[PDB]
Design a protein around this nucleic acid. Structure first.
Ligand SMILES: [Zn+2]
Lengths: 82, 24, 62, 98, 213, 133
RNA sequence: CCGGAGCGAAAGCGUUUGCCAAGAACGUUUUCAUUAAUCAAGAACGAAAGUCGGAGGUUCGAAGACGAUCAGAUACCGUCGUAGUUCCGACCGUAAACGAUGCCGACCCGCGAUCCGGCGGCGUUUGACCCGCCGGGCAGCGUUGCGGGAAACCACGAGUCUCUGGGCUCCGGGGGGAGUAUGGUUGCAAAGCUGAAACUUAAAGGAAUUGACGGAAGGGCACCACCAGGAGUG
């Protein structure tokens, strides 16, 4: 690696390296639309929820705070947005 | 040995204080 | 008290001892081959010779 | 001059280890610096396994083993020919002898 | 002057019905001479006997202590006093590059027999495991050690002395712990290494005759 | 002890095979009754070879004779070294005493090794610089 | 079990369980918005030994007694054994307290493991295991080190210093006298910190090479050596 192109790196390296050591730093997180199996309202939930997220005006629990990404409850489908 | 030369100096200046404290 | 047992040398292992005067060999009895013991030997011994050990109990610790 | 990179022991990131006592001289030697030798040998040596087999009351009885953990200090391990001196470049070989 | 073995008369020690080989062996003691008798001198002897000498075909690394409780006509009956493994078995299981989980409980049976069971378990290396050391985190060790105490308490507190011995001749209490702790960390050599009988209830002839009966 | 077919009357042989001496102690199954006990020092008069394998061999042959007079036929071997805070390796009289019992017309069964080993030892004799010589 | 493994600012830290407070790393598209780095005189902690007042005192064991060994042996070895060794409260603030290597930050080789957190992937087993990636940490090998150095050796840099400058604290100036004298200061004491001079000396010392030597290891060879013997000699 004597003549390496530092201005135009492959997206595999930018996605692999640390979020702070990139060419331009970008978070590895995202937002998701968690859908409760019972109700139908869509609630935007952060990837690393860090908080016990429950549906407003309901009883079902959506996410559980973990070390990294939130562990969604069984059957709670989601989709990431951009 | 160097640790015993230090032990002798400790015992040497200890009796120096005895013969100096007795003269006051 | 044990009887004087005869033993035939089956293979010599080489010269041993402090001044190399002894020859540690493994013996083999003629009557009953159900016992094998190693014994030091002091003197010129050929292959297949027969020695007359008295104790026949203690080993030589190689 | 520094003779060994590991200072003759195995201590990385620590300040003090529990000192153990040697076997044949009873000298306080650190646990990591001591020259350990796990010897696993039968209670009955090969010179008497046949006599015990003939005197055994069972038909198939495997003789037990004697697990002895030996801790030798550097002074006694060299004297007992457990370890020896090696060449300046042959000291780096950490693989035990086969 | 006189030979001491002239007064020695032999008694036959016997094992309870929990074992197959009931005739255990012979023991000698001086005849009743003076104020001392021969019965009380025999009611304190402990016999460490391997399990293979009591059952038909079992393991030989498990020992059993049998204390004599009564002498009934030239043969003195024994009773369970404590279990222990062989030194060779204990030293052979303790290997390197693994962790050992020890646990001890103090549980009394349905009858007033206070026992102290000692459990020992080693982590098992996977078949496809390439990593040398098979260690368990401190929290995994606590859950395994907690599971040992939970099972040993349930298997002893809800049974009598006879049923516990029947659960000790085969190491069933060691097998279920190995199966229970499979979800935490696969164990290798779960055994009950020792069982101490701390407190013994008031000796009654009916309970002893029920065992040997 | 009249037994049918002349079965083996098992005993327990405690072999304290330490250094400087060797105890060949044969007891009953309970161990409380001593059948016969003879040491390596009882067969020699020089203190330097009380632990010699020859001294332990003579003791094993003497203790084997006393067992036959009383009815003992088989022996359960329980070898023991010094143990405890001191060394735990059996002395030179271990193999000699054990082999001499098997060669003296005795039966051996259930060999074991009961050496006192501490879960945490006390301070051993000799300073931290050890027995230097 | 127990590892060139973990944690802690060091000293140091290994049975189970409970309680109290604290901490690193990781995760974050949370918050404050320069609050930072290193730091004289100050301050906390600080192995072992030692001191003071109680409790305790199993082992070990300064001193001491005795038995050996020796020309002598108040040593080495052995048998007994005091203060100590353990705990509580209060002092001393010393170690080969060592990585003999201050702390913060930047750039700088490769490879395979290891501990912790996180992410992804294909199966096996009731989380465990297998294959990669990221951050942090204890280390290792190949570097025959792109470089450095008097070598030895150094990628926890001892690299980016004559092509000499990121910030800051402590600290060295030939070897002895000497960590001594005196003064100040601290301490119950032992002692700690601070600390010279007269005088004396041409070397002291570092790394490596060759040789010699070893009551160091391994491998070999002759009766000017020995074993077994023959002649003796004295
Ligand atoms: Zn030693």
């Amino acid at each position: 690696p004597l003549a390496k192109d530092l201005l135009h790196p492959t997206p595999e390296e930018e996605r692999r390296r640390h979020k702070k050591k990139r060419l331009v730093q970008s978070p590895n997180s995202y937002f998701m639309d968690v859908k409760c199996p019972g109700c139908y309202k869509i609630t935007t939930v952060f990837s690393h929820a860090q908080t016990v997220v429950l549906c407003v005006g309901c009883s079902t629990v959506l996410c559980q705070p973990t070390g990294g990404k939130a562990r969604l409850t069984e059957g709670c489908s989601f989709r990431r947005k951009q | 040995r160097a640790k015993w030369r230090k032990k002798r100096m400790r015992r040497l200046k200890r009796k120096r204080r005895k013969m100096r404290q007795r003269s006051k | 008290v044990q009887p004087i047992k005869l033993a035939r040398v089956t293979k010599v292992l080489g010269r041993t001892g402090s001044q190399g005067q002894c020859t540690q060999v493994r013996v083999e009895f003629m009557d009953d081959s159900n016992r094998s013991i190693i014994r030091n030997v002091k003197g010129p011994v050929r292959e297949g010779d027969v020695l007359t050990l008295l104790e026949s109990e203690r080993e030589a610790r190689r | 001059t520094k003779k060994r990179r590991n200072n003759g022991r195995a201590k990385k990131g620590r300040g003090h280890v529990q000192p153990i006592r040697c076997t044949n001289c009873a000298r306080c030697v650190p646990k990591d610096k001591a020259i350990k030798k796990f010897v696993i040998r039968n209670i009955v040596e090969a010179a008497a396994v046949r006599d015990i087999s003939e005197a055994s009351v069972f038909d198939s009885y495997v003789l037990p083993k004697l697990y002895v953990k030996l801790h030798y200090c550097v002074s006694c391990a060299i004297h007992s020919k457990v370890v020896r001196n090696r060449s300046r470049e042959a000291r780096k070989d950490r693989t035990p002898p086969p | 002057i006189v030979d001491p073995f002239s007064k020695k008369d032999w008694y036959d020690v016997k094992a309870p019905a929990m074992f197959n080989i009931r005739n255990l062996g012979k023991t000698l003691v001086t005849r009743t001479q003076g104020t001392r008798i021969a019965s009380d001198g025999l009611k304190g002897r402990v016999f460490e006997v391997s399990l293979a000498d009591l059952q038909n075909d079992e393991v030989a690394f498990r020992k059993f202590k049998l204390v004599t409780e009564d002498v009934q006509g030239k043969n003195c009956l024994t009773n369970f006093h404590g279990m222990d493994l062989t030194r060779d078995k204990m030293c052979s299981m303790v290997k390197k590059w693994q962790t050992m989980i020890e646990a001890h409980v103090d549980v009394k049976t349905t009858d007033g027999y206070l026992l102290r069971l000692f459990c020992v378990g080693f982590t098992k290396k996977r078949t496809n495991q390439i990593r040398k050391t098979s260690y368990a985190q401190h929290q995994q060790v606590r859950q395994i050690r907690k599971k040992m105490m939970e099972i040993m308490t349930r298997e002893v507190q809800t049974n009598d002395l006879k049923e516990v011995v029947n659960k000790l001749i085969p190491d069933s209490v060691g097998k279920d712990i190995e199966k229970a702790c499979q979800s935490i960390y696969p164990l290798h050599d779960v055994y009950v290494r020792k069982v101490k009988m701390l407190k013994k209830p008031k000796f009654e002839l009916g309970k002893l005759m029920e065992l040997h009966g | 002890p009249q037994v049918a077919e002349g079965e083996n009357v098992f005993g327990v042989c405690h072999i304290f095979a330490s250094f400087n001496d060797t105890f060949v102690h044969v007891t009953d199954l309970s161990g409380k009754e001593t059948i016969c006990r003879v040491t390596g020092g009882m067969k020699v008069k020089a203190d330097r070879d009380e632990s010699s394998p020859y001294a332990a061999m003579l003791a094993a042959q003497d203790v084997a004779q006393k067992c036959k007079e009383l009815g003992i036929t088989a022996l359960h071997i329980k070898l023991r070294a010094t143990g405890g805070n001191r060394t735990k390796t059996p002395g030179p009289g271990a193999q000699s005493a054990l082999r001499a019992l098997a060669r003296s017309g005795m039966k051996i069964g259930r060999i074991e090794d009961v050496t006192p080993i501490p879960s945490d030892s006390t301070r051993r004799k000799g300073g931290r610089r050890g027995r230097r010589l």
